[PDB]
Amino acid sequence: TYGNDTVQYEWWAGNARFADQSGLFIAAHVAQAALTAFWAGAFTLFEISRFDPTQAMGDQGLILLPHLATLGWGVGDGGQIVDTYPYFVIGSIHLIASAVLGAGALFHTLRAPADLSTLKGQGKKFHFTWENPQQLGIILGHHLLFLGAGALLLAGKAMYWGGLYDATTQTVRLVSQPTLDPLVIYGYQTHFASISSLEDLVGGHIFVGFLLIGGGIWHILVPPLGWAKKVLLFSGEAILSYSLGGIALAGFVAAYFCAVNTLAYPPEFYGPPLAIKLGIFPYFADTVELPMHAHTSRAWLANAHFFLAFFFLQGHLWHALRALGFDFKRVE
Amino acid sequence: LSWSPKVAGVMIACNILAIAFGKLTIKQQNVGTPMPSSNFFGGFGLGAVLGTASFGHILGAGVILGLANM
């Protein structure tokens, strides 16, 4: 991002060419979202064929089917699955959503131009750059409602469209009328590792979606005034580092949330809650041990979300160093 | 015989002995695919450092399996 205007990028660094073009920028980022939707649908259909109803869910290595059994899609009483097909409708939709998102991925790099400033209609108001703060606030502002939308879609699922599975009573709990106070949310910062409460899970999700919808209307209507510009930067790898350090924090707290929690990650499907060990690296080792050399899904999810978020933290260090005034500096 | 700091210690020690060997006696070292820097060891390059790390692993399996039964 530094030096001259155009620097020769080799094929091992070729994705630093469309960063400023803003037309192919949408094409790669929804091709990526098509790949996650491809992994959402195909790898929950890959695990239908490798599903054993008699054997327990933890030792088999089932990842995504415990994620749908948490939401009470097709789980029965006692901790078993009574019907496979509700796990098949959601994977079918995610594969079709992977097709249409993959369809528009080639739309924004074959027929749509390399930028969005050549357009004249509604598409002329979609071009952006790494300089204008009011142009990056309208992109960020419309994102904050969709993150707040998943909380209200969680509320309508939990209140009127299905229950949740827990370990305190071990059944599908179609609950309603959650807690109406915000003072205990300040107190849950010290024992979030064991929530031990089902009505506050959906009760905190509505109490955080009201905050996420507050940041949506705020970020659209007003631009950055300048109190953020004097302390921060506005560049290509700059705004990359604000996010890539932030999503690294999300993978950090989710790798910790997998190994110790019981309610949101039920132990009847993921396996028993792990213990934090540190040898050379901090790895969430299993408490009980398997007869073969296999590990449970809680051991796989918590260890992979920590190893890969640690590299995503140190990759945030790679971009924050280059977004600031620092070269490679191979001196002495 | 399993994962331990003892087997990793003798592996790393004979590996860096093999890096010093490749830095001492390889005839042409630098002219391959270029390394990003010279911070690791010498001025090797990508193919050269892959070669001396692979010889570190060959020497590693040598003394480890020569001492796991002795």
């Binding site: 050399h293 | 994962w3 391959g32 590693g60």
Partner: protein, 739 residues
């Protein structure tokens, strides 16, 4: 570093109707009938058609793809005949009793009697190639897998044909792509040999080990799980071996000692099925894969590390050897004949190694029990090896005549070896004559001492005994090897050195082969004939440039009949005629070698077994005191064992009798071409042209006799064909009569 030219040769069918276009003197017109023979004598002489080193190399590459299509359609025919017209599932139901047969004969003229009762009601001709035991070693269960393998082989046959057309007429590589010999060597080491060995190690781990394990347990056909079901359910593989529950994770942490239950170093033979252990061969192919891919990174291509072979050849120079190998890297990358001579030499010795290893360490299940399979596989690989070694002696001489430039290699090893050709050949023929007297005159001496009624003056064991002490000491070391010099090995390398008698199904797989004085004399016979064939071929290589008789031999060519009747006579002086003599001497050498093999193994090794431990052989131990006489080789071997070829009419072994007499016919027919010369036949053919001109039927193609080189070539071809067909019919009919 890929250099490809695009569309060098247009694809057209119009050149197919003009035969002889590749050479300048053949495309003019067939004025004479010898042009026809020249059309086949120069059809693959690609160095005489093009002289630019780039057109010939791509012609060779596409010819390799065409020959690969021929091998793939041959292998497809083997798997298709094993699928449709065989009894592979019937033989797999009962391997000890019934006999394999993979060829059914159409009854037309009375040849339905060739479909003998091979066991189980199935009729056909009993095969001796023994690829059924190859299929049981690989893990074939039903005929549908053989049928789909034949279909996939025909697919790759058409794929190799398309690759040949693509690499000659569409995208043909340049000369620098062919001369990248270090990239070719390390790709062939790692990606072809080592990667193929790793593939077969994986197949032997996953398919060949569990199927043969439960087949040795006694599971009937149509009850074996399918080979993919062991991968689809690893519990069925983990119940057979305890180490498969450990997963891949001990392999990467160098915890290989827990893999010891299924990668064993047992050695010897399997006592249940009479072959090598499949866990032993799986560990074996894995070790060969690791060593080859390690050796597959030795030569530098693009990344600096690696040995370019030029300074390897520069560095080896001593006091005796002058400038050393200075120039050989420029020789072997600019001349295909020197590469062909080295590769034919080492492939011939490899094939002889294959024969000498596939009889004392039988690698296939129920292979050592079937004596016909063992004898046929031995002698056929012996013959292929000896043929390729004679071809090495040929292409060395062709390199000397047409690919040897003396200005480039001065005072190197090639020039120094050509400078003392007399000091090599005059000692080689001395050791030929010394071995000849001391391996054949021993046989004449005790033939005469037996004929004169004095057996105490022979060279027998009770007589003056020539005990082969060196190989007996080597057998003692191989018997004492497991526990002292191979402590992790349970059994020996083989049971032919020393050990117990392996009995499987009432027959003997392998017992220790003691070496008396008869083995001493016949091994010196083998060393003698090896030395004479290595004399004729070596003095065809060295004396191909020039000599003191005729010093103009390089300008006359490699393949010329003579220089003339002068200097006393110079017929058969070329480098070609030394190959013509070496072919007969390879025939004589390998005939005595396979005769020694067949007689020693059916007198001291094979035979039935008895439950009290005593072994009775097929010929009751004749090799001890009756293999030392020429009359003993004639009476007790060539007369007594040929009775199974003689008295087998009206039976299944009836075609071998009319191949026995057929091989005698082609031998006797070869003598007409060998003994006579051309000018008699020219003087006779011109009289037949007179008798045709009397009736106005004389052809406008001028009919005349064969060339002198052509007459010697058809003589040696019919001689080798007739002798090998006679030995093939005798060995097959004898060893199918004895079981």
């Amino acid at each position: 570093k890929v250099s490809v030219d695009n569309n060098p040769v247009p694809t057209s069918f119009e050149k197919w109707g003009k035969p002889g276009h590749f050479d300048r003197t053949l495309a003019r017109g067939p004025k004479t009938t010898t042009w026809i023979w020249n059309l086949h004598a120069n059809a693959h002489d690609f160095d005489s058609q093009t002289s630019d080193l780039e057109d010939v190399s791509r012609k060779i590459f596409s010819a390799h793809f065409g020959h690969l299509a021929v091998v793939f359609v041959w292998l497809s025919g083997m798997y298709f005949h094993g699928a449709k017209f065989s009894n592979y599932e019937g033989w797999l139901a009962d391997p000890t009793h019934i006999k394999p047969s993979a060829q059914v004969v159409w009854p037309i003229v009375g040849q339905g009697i060739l479909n003998g009762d091979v066991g189980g009601g199935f009729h056909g001709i009993q095969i001796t190639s023994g690829l059924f035991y190859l299929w049981r070693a690989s893990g074939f269960t039903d005929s549908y897998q053989l049928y789909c393998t034949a279909i996939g082989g025909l697919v790759m046959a058409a794929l190799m044909l398309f690759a040949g057309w693509f690499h000659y007429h569409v995208k043909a590589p340049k000369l620098e792509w062919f001369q990248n010999v270090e990239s070719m060597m390390n790709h062939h080491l790692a990606g072809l040999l080592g990667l193929g060995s790793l593939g077969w190690a994986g197949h032997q781990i996953h398919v060949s080990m569990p199927i043969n394990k439960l087949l040795d347990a006694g599971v009937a056909p149509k009850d074996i799980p399918l080979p993919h079901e062991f991968i689809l359910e690893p519990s069925k593989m983990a119940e057979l071996y305890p180490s498969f529950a450990q997963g891949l994770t001990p392999f990467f942490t160098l915890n290989w000692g827990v893999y010891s239950d299924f990668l064993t170093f047992k050695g010897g033979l399997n006592p249940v099925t009479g072959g090598l252990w499949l866990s032993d061969t799986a560990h074996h192919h894995l070790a060969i894969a690791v060593l080859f891919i390690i050796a597959g990174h030795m030569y530098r291509t693009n990344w600096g590390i690696g040995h370019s072979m030029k300074e390897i050849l520069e560095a080896h120079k001593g006091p005796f050897t002058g400038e050393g190998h200075k120039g050989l890297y420029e020789i072997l990358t600019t001349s295909w004949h020197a590469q062909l001579a080295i590769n034919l030499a080492l492939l011939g010795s490899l094939t002889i190694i294959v024969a000498q290893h596939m009889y004392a360490m039988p690698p296939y299940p129920y292979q050592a029990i079937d004596y016909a399979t063992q004898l046929s596989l031995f002698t056929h690989h012996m013959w292929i090896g000896g043929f390729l070694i004679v071809g090495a002696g040929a292409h060395g001489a062709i390199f000397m005549v047409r690919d040897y430039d003396p200005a480039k290699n001065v005072n190197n090893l090639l020039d120094r070896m050509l400078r003392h050709r007399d000091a090599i050949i005059s000692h080689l023929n001395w050791v030929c004559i010394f071995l000849g007297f001391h391996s054949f005159g021993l046989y004449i001496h005790n033939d005469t001492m037996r004929a004169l009624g004095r057996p105490q003056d022979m060279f027998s064991d009770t007589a003056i005994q020539l005990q082969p002490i060196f190989a007996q000491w080597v057998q003692h070391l191989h018997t004492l090897a497991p526990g002292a010099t191979a402590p992790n090995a349970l059994a020996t390398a083989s049971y032919a050195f020393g050990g117990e008698t392996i009995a499987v199904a009432g027959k003997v797989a392998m017992m220790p082969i003691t070496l008396g004085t008869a083995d001493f004399m016949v091994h010196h016979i083998h060393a003698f004939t090896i030395h004479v064939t290595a004399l004729i071929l070596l003095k065809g290589v060295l004396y191909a440039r020039s000599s003191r008789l005729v010093p103009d031999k390089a300008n006359l060519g490699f393949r010329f009949p003579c220089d003339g009747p002068g200097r006393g006579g110079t017929c058969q002086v070329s480098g070609w005629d030394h190959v013509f003599l070496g072919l007969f001497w390879m025939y004589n050498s390998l005939s005595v070698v396979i005769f020694h093999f067949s007689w020693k193994m059916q007198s001291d090794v094979w035979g039935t077994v008895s439950p009290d431990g005593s072994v009775t052989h097929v010929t009751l131990g004749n090799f001890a005191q009756s293999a030392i006489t020429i009359n003993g080789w004639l009476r007790d071997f060539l007369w007594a064992q040929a009775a199974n070829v003689i008295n087998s009419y009206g039976s299944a072994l009836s075609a071998y009798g009319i191949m026995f007499l057929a091989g005698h016919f082609v031998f006797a027919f070869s003598l007409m071409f060998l003994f006579s010369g051309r000018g008699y036949w020219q003087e006779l053919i011109e009289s037949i042209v007179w008798a045709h001109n009397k009736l106005n039927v004389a052809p406008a193609i001028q009919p005349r006799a064969l060339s002198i080189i052509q007459g010697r070539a058809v003589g040696v071809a019919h001689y080798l064909l007739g002798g090998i067909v006679t030995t093939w019919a005798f060995f097959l009919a004898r060893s199918l009569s004895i079981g």
